[PDB]
Structure formats: structure tokens, C-alpha cells
Amino acid sequence: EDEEDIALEFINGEKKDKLVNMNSFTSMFDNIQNVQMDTFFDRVMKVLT
Amino acid sequence: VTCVGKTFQIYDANTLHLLFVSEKETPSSIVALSAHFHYVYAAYENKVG
Amino acid sequence: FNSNNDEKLNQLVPILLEISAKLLASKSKDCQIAAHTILVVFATALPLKKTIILAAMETILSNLDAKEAKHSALLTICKLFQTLKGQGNVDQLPSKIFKLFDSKFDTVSILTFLDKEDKPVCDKFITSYTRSIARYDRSKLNIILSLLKKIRLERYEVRLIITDLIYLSEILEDKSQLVELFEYFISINEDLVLKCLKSLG
Amino acid sequence: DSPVLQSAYDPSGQYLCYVTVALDKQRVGVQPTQRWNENFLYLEDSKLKVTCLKWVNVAIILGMNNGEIWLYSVLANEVTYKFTTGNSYEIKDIDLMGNQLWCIDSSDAFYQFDLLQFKLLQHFRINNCVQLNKLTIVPAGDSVAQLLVASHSISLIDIEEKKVVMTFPGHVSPVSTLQVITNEFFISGAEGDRFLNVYDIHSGMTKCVLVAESDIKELSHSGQADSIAVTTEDGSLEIFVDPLVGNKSKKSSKKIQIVSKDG
Amino acid sequence: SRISSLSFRTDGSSHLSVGTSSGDLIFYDLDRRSRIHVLKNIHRESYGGVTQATFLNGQPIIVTSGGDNSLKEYVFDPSLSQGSGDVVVQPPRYLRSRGGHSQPPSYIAFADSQSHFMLSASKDRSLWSFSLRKDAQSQEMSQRLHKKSKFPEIVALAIENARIGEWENIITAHKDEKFARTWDMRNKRVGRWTFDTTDDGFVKSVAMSQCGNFGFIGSSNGSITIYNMQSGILRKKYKLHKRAVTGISLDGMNRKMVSCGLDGIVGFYDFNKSTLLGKLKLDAPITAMVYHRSSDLFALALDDLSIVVIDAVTQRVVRQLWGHSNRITAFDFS
Amino acid sequence: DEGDINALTKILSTTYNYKDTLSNSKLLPPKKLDIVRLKDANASHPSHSAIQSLSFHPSKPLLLTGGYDKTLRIYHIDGKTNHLVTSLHLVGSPIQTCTFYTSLSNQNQQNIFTAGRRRYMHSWDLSLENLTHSQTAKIEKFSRLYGHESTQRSFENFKVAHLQNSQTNSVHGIVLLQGNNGWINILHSTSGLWLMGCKIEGVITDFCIDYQPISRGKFRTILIAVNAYGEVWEFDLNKNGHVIRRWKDQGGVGITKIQVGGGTTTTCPALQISKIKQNRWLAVGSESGFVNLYDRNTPTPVAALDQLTTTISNLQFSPDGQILCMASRAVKDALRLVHLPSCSVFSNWPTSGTPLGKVTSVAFSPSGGLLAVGNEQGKVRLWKLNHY
Amino acid sequence: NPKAFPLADAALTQQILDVVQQAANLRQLKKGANEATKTLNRGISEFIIMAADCEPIEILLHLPLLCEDKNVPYVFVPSRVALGRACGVSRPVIAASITTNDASAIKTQIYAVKDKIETLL
Amino acid sequence: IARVLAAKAAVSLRYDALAEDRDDSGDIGLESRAKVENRLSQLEGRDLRTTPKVVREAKKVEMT
RNA sequence: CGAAGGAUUUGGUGGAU
């Protein structure tokens, strides 16, 4: 085995994630009234995921 | 007051316009400058002017 | 006032992380998880040094008392390690952070966290947590076996876990749970276990 | 320009070591001048570059931009030992006499090494040397008692006194070559210059100014001032026959060129 | 980091300005125990970064200096909040500065007959204009290009003023550049025209007519190309020299042209009728040329350490000068 | 006035730099790509026609270029001078594609295969001193299909892959061809013998190859075939070119080509048996401009890249396979780089000022992170990815 | 998708999509369900293509009612993403119509597929 | 909104009319509204008049 | 044409007038 193989193994193991754009959290203001703010954090994670 | 090789130049902070310049060049490069009102102390080799 | 400019995110980070630290300092559970909401976005928006990522957990876990904030904290901490993408991505937590995490989050708590089907991606943390267990706690080695079954970890992460456990066998006494952990690696992906053994002994 | 970034004959003149860049990685190779060796040392990182190449009497010492010196055995095809200075400044020049080894950094700090012992002996900086692109050790007896250093002018320094003993007015451009043709007569040449100044070490007066057709790249000296061969920038070789014998300025006597049959 | 300078703000604000050899100036609010701002790369790290940074007494302006031949002033503007001004602090704003070449100048030339300004090129790839009066004004020529890093250092330059203010009036040659760039004094900006040697040779000589309509380029391969400044269009090309052309000149009458090269020949031409008037061979290669238009005399720096003066009218050596003990760097006519 | 909670506040004070240094990071940044332009390849000796194909030498620092000039111009890519090693004019043989080849077992063996809109193909033996020293050359023309002449009209489209004969465990090269009606003809690289044939429904437009390791010293070669403007296929070559899997690309319209990466391939060949690796990415182009990316680890594409809007004439992964370059010959500057697995196009590069022209050929160096892009003007521009 | 009847086979869909692409370049194509309705109102529709995977399928089932009233052939293709791609748009299209033009350059191919769809019906 | 609402009305309508086994729930209508309401909100949030930025004139500073 | 974009407007400072 060689260290370069281990490096490519790290790289293969890596996985994608949903990037954040400008228009991702604009709709929060629409549903910002009378919402349990725990639910607001849950929605934040849902959009982020 | 700023050191320029073997001579010093004094600038007016309002405009950075030159006010005076050393009448003669020092025999040795100036190592330190200290300014007090109308008098500026210039040090070169083993002599302070 | 920034958005896309990557240079210009960086000047926000002094301002808004200090706000998050103050919010975490507030005893109000609402203030703390607001900082959890704040912190998680910046980690994904901009990659940050593991030292800062580590320092955030220390602040998050210091005043973590409310149950709801405990749920929010565990989602953030996993996400922050997901963003971490450098050498030490899955390296073990230090002694103090590991002690702090287990105190606020017992092993049974995370086993429930792994249990739920809708769990967020946390393999990097579990790999980092898994190694921290082996280094510092010998009794919890059985719990490592349960954790690995619950969550499928990345191939390099499994290799690194196998690497440390090989050292543990040489140093720490052989145990039924330890061989079971090896036998678990024997059952799944036989060949990679040999590669770790070949490279290490 | 030429692909060969740097090159150097061995003292015997029978083997030439040259460096070229393959993709973004420099590879060092040696070929027999008198008459293929397909084996090249490869620098594993793109940033790594060799700044200096010198033969050792079968090892070649390599200066690099990192701030360390590598001893390379061509037969084995691996670096036997690496001399690392405390600093990370690039090495500008290097020179050798037996075990003695002297190198200079871009921070203008002198350093001394021992090949046999693999140790840094001393490291000192002498004032009035703002820059240092050339280092040459004078061949006095079997020990180093003076050193010739040039950046744009030329300066002579004593190791024991750690101070300049003499200064020579050099070229406007940075000095490229500082070979010592004989005692009290060392030649000097600068980048982008067609003139070579020969200076007297003891007296300091320019004995002669040798003039070439075009810019000079490399210099070779024969015997003791018997003949000087200089490789011009245009790709021609000029030979100076007895340059140390109007008198101030001398020109090339023989010129050599290579042209293909096609033209 | 390495500390190079320190100073406090005496305007009633508990601020500390922290300088570093890296060229970075940091400001701290001691009352609040926080960093106000960092000013990056104000002075070159290679030249010692910020050598000295001092707040003016009782004032929000800070003066900063370094080894890069630059003196700058920055002003802390007042806060945009009537309340909590200490928290809400404006970042420092550049106020005024003085500077010059960071390395020894390569070439110089007098901008105008009145002798008030000079043009200067240095190895730092910057073209500067310096005033010769007490004002001591200094500006950097803009390198922003016209559209229809710094350029390599200038290896030849000439200036004319018969035609300033309507099109380009400067020609410059750079090291290892196969073409020449034009500049305009009045706009103080790089020009819109580029002149190429057209023979795969490097530019070695740049010269201009007194009328300011023709630009002359000497190539390393021995060709002389002629462009028109207003349109930057090649009009005439000459090929007599086989080696590099080290000097080109033209008379004020715009009739007789003289050229010299490393091959050692001096070519005499009729610009109007475009003919070879005569060719003169010298013993040694010619290094440089200076043409005195009023007297129609020009001197040549030969490799034998001599200055040979020739009269263009009769094409004969009139005076030869000996005494220099090495190559001659430069010379000029009174 | 003169784990702990205030740790976060402390670490903010210590440093004003907050980006984790990318020098340590081994995965290139998502949206920011660090690229610097270098000297061009064809500057030393220009080509008189468009650059139809480019190919990096597997190990040596050489570049191969071909075009309708009918010349195989070889350059020593050094990034600063790029001088020409050797060239070969083939009268009456327009070069539609060309490629280096190294025998997987015999590293000493070197060969170049080239063909065009002709019923023959040329081989160029680079073994021993032929590349540079030899005054005269060893060349072989493959013009015999052994009774399958009807299926094939020309050799213009081909690729070279490695086939392991499991019954004897020997490994040898194979030359792959595109037939008239969904036909793929399989030939021996050296002897030229016809080995096997694969057939698909519809018009074959493109195909690619994937390697599946089995055990130590054992690997299998898989052929994948695609249709012009929507549809896909697959075969297994080590069991006589029979089908082993069928699937359709979702939203299967647009299509022009297909490619695999993350492991061994034409651009990233292996040097020994152990280096053979499976490709974890599959990209299927289109002339509409879409790119359906599939994770090889009916399938659902992970992403549908739609930045480009024209003929995707070049799909290629990086040798280590985190970057997809998608390029078009229809119009100028129609080239994009897609980060993987994020599937996000880089924004900083290319720019409007980027000189690309009518992109007709692209090549990734096996190592050193070099990108070569040819254009219809006969010009190859070179770039360096600073991350590698 | 039982409601979608008749549904073209793998072969036929390829020919239909090829014609759809050619009509798109020649601006002979009106794409989208409502445009498809507009064409039937004027009787300028040569035939209409719909996607079976549309959900709810109801939003296009009205076109068959219009189509049989006006004796215009119609057909169903499996994928909506494929059809919109064939149209030349960045969004899936559930329905498309070929406008009638006896002076078009692709008249023969359009009339050919119309006959096949007529046989399918 | 009239153009958008009319388009969704046809969507909701034709499910009501042409559905063989429609559930009397209006779910297709319910989801259609949220699209229109979201369309209204973002359209509503748009401001035709350009925002004025915070004016920051580099006022003259003269030494005292 | 074209090395890590182009087009317009505008605040401030510096130098001349």
C-alpha cells in the first residue's frame, strides 16, 4: 500500500453537501409569525440539509 | 522629519509640502532622528548634530 | 452586505460569532439555540478552522441545560464536523471536550440519536467520537460496537478506526469486546482489515 | 530560452548534470559527456526548485528555494543527506573545498557545513552586504581564509575577522559569474552584460575588460589563464586566447557555432 | 507576527495602533478589549513593512512610513451613529501620501523645456513623474490600458513635446518584450498604441522625430520599423544592420536619419526619399547614441572605451575621446 | 481593569484570519478554483489546422496533438518552453483522434494509435529509441477486419483499453471501434485480430470503458455504449462481449457522449495490475447542454448540470476525478468546470477574457494538474490547477 | 398510468421526439398544455404529444377530449423531462403540439409520424 | 396574480372535472394556493423604487 | 479581439488653473 492510495481513499469517502445560496432563507420571514422557534431551527436544518 | 540617506527632510502634515531640508549632507548615514519644537537631533556615526 | 464575496464573509465572522458566544452565555434556552441557528449557517457558508469549531462546542456545551437546546446542540455539533474538511477531519476530540460532551450527552443519548432513521449525516463526528472513546475510556469499547452497527461510516473512517484499535490491542489487554470489535471488522469488509494489519504490523 | 534551467560540468569534464522541468516538477539528470541514462531525480512538489548545482569529488550538491541543501548520489539515484539551515530563505550560491561547504541565503546570511560530520558550524551576517547572489571561496592553501562575495559590486571578506577586507567596483546588473581564474586575478560577469571584468585581488585595479559579441551565459577557464570559453546568449561560443597577457579591452579570437545541415 | 511600531490615539479614544514587520497595521480598542480594524499590506514586507506608525497628538490621523519609499496618512472619520459611537467606529480612510521609486531608477528624462518635471523608470516596473520645484510633487503614470501586474522594466525611452496633448508623445521599450508601449504625459497614462519589431527581435532602441509624428523602433535582429503615433500604423521598415540596432536618431529637418548597431556600422539615410546616403564602419561595436539636432553632431559610445563624434552632414569622424578605464554607462550633449 | 464558556470569545481574539488554509486541505475548494495560465504548447511549432485530439503520455512528460493537417506533432510539455520533440506527417490520413498506449504488463512497450475518416488505422511503435533517436520509424497499418467489413465503414472513432484473459491470466490491449448500426468491433492492439463484437439497438454515438477489480491480479473490463440524443447501453468484454446490465438515463434526451472516472480510464491509465480502480462517476452529455451525472457506487442522476446550452463534444473527469470539464465545439468559450461531488460549477474561471475559442479537444495530465485545451484555430492553451 | 392510452413504444417515442426537435428549431412547435389547447381551438394543430408521467395526469386528460372531437391524432410519451428537453427548454413539458404548415421543410417526416400515430390510435 | 391564479385554477379545475376517483378533499387545490400565495409574497416583497444607500461622504478633516 | 470580465454614473483626496 502507498500513502497516495490512502489519500484517494479519503477523497472517495467524502460526500456532497447542500450549499447555501442567497435565496435560501428569504421565505423564513413569510412564516416568521407565531412559530415555535425550535421549529424555526428545525426548518433551518431542513433547508440546510 | 524623515531621513533620506545622508540628509533629512521635514514635511508639513497639513499638505505634506516640504518646509526645510538639511543644509549639508552628513559624513555618515543618519541612524536616528529626534525632533523637539524648532530643533531636530540627527545622529550619525559617533556624532549627534 | 457581503453575500457572495468570500473575502467579505470573514469580516462578519468577528462580529456575529461574538454575538453567538454572548447568546450562548445567556441562561435563556431561546438565546442559546438562536446561537445554534446562527452558528450552523456560517459553518456551511464558510469553512472554518477546527480550533474555532472546537472552541464553539466548548461554549455550546458549557451552559447547555435545557432539554430542547440539548437537541439543537447535538444537531449543530454534528453539522460543524461535517463542514470540517482538513487533516484532523475525524481525529479524536481532546480529553476536555470529550469529557464535556459525554457529561452533557450520555452514551445512551447518542445511541438514541443514531437510532432514529432521520438522523443527519454525522459520520465524521462519530468517527472522531469513536476514537476518543478508545483513547480515554476502556469500559465504553462495547458501546463502540453498537455505534458502528447503527451508523455506516465512510471507508477511510473505518480504516482509521481499525488503525487505532490495532494499537489498542498491542497496548491494552485483549478483551472479549475488543476481539468482537475486530470480529465485527472481520464480518464486514475482510480485506480492508488485512490492509490495516499489513500497514501496521 | 533554453529548457535547461541549470547545468554544470564535473571538474573532470566527463559528466554533465542538468535540470529540466517535466510538467511542473523539476527533474535532475546526469549524462556522460564523453561518448543514455534515463534515470532522473524528480522533485515531488511543484514549488520545489533547485537554485544551485555543484559537483562533489560521485555526488552532486543541490541548492533549493526551500532553504536546505541536498547531497545526491547519482549512482544510487537518491538523496543521501539533506543539510537544512534554520531559516527558510532560498540559497543563492554555494561553494566547496573538501569538507568545507559555504552557502548563502536570500536573507544575506552566511552558513558553513561539514560534509564528513553533517553539521552546521557557524552562521554570521556581515554589514555592508545588502544582497548576495554569488559566493566563491578563494583557493588559498588547504583552508579557507577569505571569501569573494558579489551582488552588484564585488566584496572580499575574511572568515576570522568576519569583516570586509576589500571592495571592487562591479557591474550595474547583478553579478552572474565570479570565477577565480588564478591567484590575484578573478573574472566577473553580470546578467545581461557582454563585458567581463578581471580584477586583481591584492591591488584591485581592473587589469582588463573582456568583451563578447553578445550576452554571456556560462564561463569556463582552462589551466591558469591559458584560455577562457564563454557561452553567449545568442547560442554561440567564444574563446579567449591568453586574456591576461587596446590592452584594457580585448575581444574574442575564435568563435564556434552549430548549424544543422538544413540550416 | 513581529512588532515594529506602536502608538496610542490621543483624541480621547482609548485606541492603540499596532504595526508589524509583515506590513500590517492593527488597531485595538483598549476599553472594549477588541480589534477595531486591520490595515493590510500598507507597506511592503520585503522592505521592512511598517517601520514607524504614529498618531498625531490630540487628533484621529495616523502617519505611517516604511522602507519602500512611501509616507501615508490615514484619518478616522467620525461615527455614523449619534449613539454608541465608541462601538460604531469608522474604518481608517486614506487621506494623503508621498512616494517614489522603491528601487534605484533605471532611466531619466526631462519632461519639458521649462525644466519643471522629470520622467523616471526603475526596476520596480513603475514609471514616475517627479517635480523639480519646492512642491516636490510626484505621481505614478497610470498603466490602465486603453481598450479598442506592472509592465517589465523599461530598457529604452524617449520623449517629445512638439505634439503633446492630442495623441501619444512617449515611446518606451521593456526588457524581454517584443514590442514598445506608448504613453501620454498630458493624461499621465499608458497610451493606446503598441509598436512591434515585426522581425522576431527584441526592442533595443526607441527614437522619435522632432515633429512628433513618427516613432522609431530598433530591433535586436537589425531591423528598423517606423510607426505613426496618431494612428500607431507601421509606415516604413529598414533592413541594413544584421546585428542589434543600439541607436536611432533623426534631424530636426526630418531629412537625414542616422542609425548604429552592435555590428559597428553607422548607417546614413534620407528619410524623405528613403535612400542609403552612406555607411561608415567603426573599429568597435557601438553601444549608445546621442544626437544633437542643433549642431547636427552625434557621439557614439564604442566598446574600446571611446566616444566618437561624427558630423551627419559630411559623414566623417570629427572628434574622438579617450580616457575612460571601462565601459561607458551613459553620456549626453550639453 | 487589569470547558470554560468564554473559549469561543477567546479564539476569535487570537486570530483575525478565519479561513482554514487550503494548503493543508486535499479536496479542492467548492466554488473557488486556483488556476494560472502557462506558456502554450503549439507556440514552438504551430499547427496548420484544428486540434482534433489531445493526449498526455501516461508517465513521460509528453503531449500528442493531431488534426486535419495529418500530422502527429509531439511536444515536451514543461510549462515554460514547450518545445517539439518529434512530428510525423501521414499523407492521406486526416487525424480525427490519436492516443498514447502503454502495455499494462510490459511497461517498456509504448505505442500511439491514430485514425480518421478512413478504412485503416496506423500504429506508431515508441518502444526503445524510436521516439527521438531513430532516423526512420516503425509503423503498422491495420486494415483487416476479418469478415466484419460490412459492420464498419471507418476507423475515425476508437478507444484503447486493457483486456485480461482470465483463462490464462494474461493481459493485452484492445482497440475498440464504432460500427454502422449499433456495432462495436473489438480488435487486438498488437496482432490486430478480431476478438469479439457487441451490438445495440439504434445508432451508436459514443462508448466508454470501466474496470472492475475482482481480486489480486484479477480485473474485468466493462463496455458502456450510448445513443445520439437520449439512450444508453452496457456490455461485459471478458465474457465474450455479452450484455450484463440495461438501464436508461432519466430525462434521456440531448445526449451526445458518455464517460466514467474516479478510477482508471484512457486519460488516467494504470501502470500495473494493482493500480486498476473502479470509476465512481458517470456523466452523460447532450447537445441541449444538460449533463446527467450518475453515482456508479432505473438509476436517478445525482444532478443535471445545465450551465452549457450547446453540443457537449467533450466530457472528461480529472485523473483523480473531482472535476468535470464539459466543453462544446459549436461556439467559442463554451467550456465549464464542474466540482464533484458538490456538482457546482466554478464561477471565477472561465471568464469572458479567457481565451478558449472553438473548443475542440481537452486533456488532463495524469499528474501535476495540467489542463490543455485545443481550439479550431490550431492552438492549444495550457493551465495549471494550483491545488494539485 | 392506465389513463394514458395509447402510449408509444420505445421505438416510436424516439421518432416523435426527433420530429419535436426539428419543429422546435423551425418554430413549428407550440409547447405547454394551454398552448396545445389554443391550437385545437383554431384547428392549427397537426398532432399533439403528451407525457404519461405527469402527476396528476388529469391536468392533460382534457386534450384527448378535444382531440377526438376535432379528429386530430394524439399520442402519449413516457417521460415529461424527455419531451421538454426535445422541445428545447430548460423545464419539463407535459404537452406539445405540431402546428400545421404545408410549406414546412419537415412536412414529410411530420406526416410520416402522424400516420404511425393514426395507426396506433 | 390573475394570470398565475387562472393557470392554477385550470389545474385545480381539471382534476375536479376529469378525475375518476377524486377524493372530496381539495388537496390539489390546497397545494395550488400555497404556490400562488408564495408567488404573491415574493411579488409583494419586490420594491419598484430603488433603495437609497447610506451616504458616506469623505468629509474634509483639517488638523487642529 | 480576448492570461483571474465588460458599460455608465458618482462621493472623497492630490496637483495645476
Domains in chain G: ranges and CATH:
1-121 (3.30.1330.30)
H-helix or E-strand containing F209? strand F204-215
Residues of F in contact with D20 (CB under 8 A): 78
For D55-85, give one letter per residue: b (16+ CB within 10 A) or e.
bbeebbbbbbebbbbbbbebeeeeeeeebeb
Rounded to 10 deg, the angle between the C190-199 and C176-187 helix axes is 120
Touch test G–E: 3 Cβ pairs or more under 8 Å: no
Phi first, then psi: what are they for G35, rounded to 5°?
-55, -45
CA distance linking residue D232 with residue D242, whole number of Å: 19
> Is strand I in 7 Å reach of the CB of E95?
yes
Measured from the CB, is E281 under 7 Å from any atom of strand I? no
- Which grid cell sits at F210? 470501466
- Please tell me what DSSP assigns to residue C89: S
Contact call for H56 and E58, based on CB within 8 A: no
Query: Nominal resolution in Å?
Result: 4.2
Report the structure determination method: cryo-EM
Element (H, E) at G14: helix G10-25
A·F CB contacts under 8 A: 23
Measured CA to CA, the distance from residue E174 to residue E152 in angstroms comes to 5
Q: Judging by DSSP bridges, how do beta strands D249-250 and D206-211 pair with one another?
A: parallel
Q: Is the CB of F355 under 7 A from strand I?
A: yes
CB F357 within 7 Å, strand I:
yes
Are G80 and G87 contacting, i.e. CB atoms less than 8 angstroms apart?
A: no
The pairing of beta strand E3-8 with beta strand E15-20: antiparallel
Consecutive H or E run containing A28 = helix A27-30
Cell of F336: 465549464
Please count the helices (runs of H) and the strands (runs of E) in chain A: 3, 0
Report the DSSP pairing between strands F281-284 and E170-174.
Answer: unpaired
Distances (CA, A) of D123 to D87, D102, D103, D107, F275: 11, 10, 10, 12, 47
Residue H54 at interface with chain E, using a CB cutoff of 8 Å: yes
| Degrees to nearest 5, angle at CA E62 with E56 and E64 | 120
Q: Could you tell me if F285 and F291 are in contact, meaning their C-beta atoms sit under 8 angstroms apart? A: yes
Q: Residue A42's CB: how many other CB atoms inside 10 A?
A: 14
| Peptide bond connecting F94 to the previous residue in cis, omega within 30 degrees of 0 | no
CB atoms within 10 A of CB E295: 12
Q: Give the residue among D148, D225, D236, D138 at the shortest CA–CA distance from D181.
A: D225
CA atoms C96, C100, C103, C106: torsion sign: negative
Chain B residue with CA closest to H64: the answer is B14
Cβ–Cβ < 8 Å for E117, E139: no
The C-alpha cell of C112 is what?
A: 438514541
All cell numbers assigned to E208: 522619435
User: Is the shortest CB-to-strand distance from E135 to strand I under 7 Å?
Assistant: yes
The DSSP secondary-structure symbol of F274 reads G
Task: Report strand pairing: E265-270 vs E275-281.
Answer: antiparallel
Who contacts B30 (Cβ-Cβ below 8 Å, separation ≥6)? B3, B6, B7, B8, B42, B43, B44
Q: F370 and D23 in contact by Cβ < 8 A? A: yes
Contact (Cβ atoms closer than 8 angstroms) between residue F71 and residue F137: no
Cα(G63)–Cα(E105) distance, integer angstroms = 83
Of the candidates A9, A41, A49, the beta carbon closest to that of C72 is on: A41
Using a CB-CB cut-off of 8 Å, the residues of chain F touching D23 are 61, 77-79, 365, 367-368, 370
Nine-digit cell string for F286: 447532450
d(CA A12, CA A5): 10
- Give all strands of the β-sheet with D68-73 in edge-to-edge order: D50-56, D59-64, D68-73, D78-84
What are the helix and strand counts (H, E) for chain C?
Answer: 12, 0
Contact C37, C73 (CB under 8 A): no
State the cell numbers at F43: 507556440
Name E301's bridge partners. E307
Print the SS3 string covering G33-79.
HHHHHHHHHHCCEEEEEEECCCCCHHHHCHHHHHHHHCCCCEEEECC
Helix (H) or strand (E) holding E288: strand E286-292
Question: DSSP label at F273?
Answer: G
**How would you list the strands of the sheet with F84-86, edge to edge?**
F53-56, F63-66, F73-75, F84-86
H or E, element range at C24? helix C12-25
Q: State the best of F4, F11, F33, F322 to mutate against chain C, taking most chain C CBs within 10 Å.
A: F11
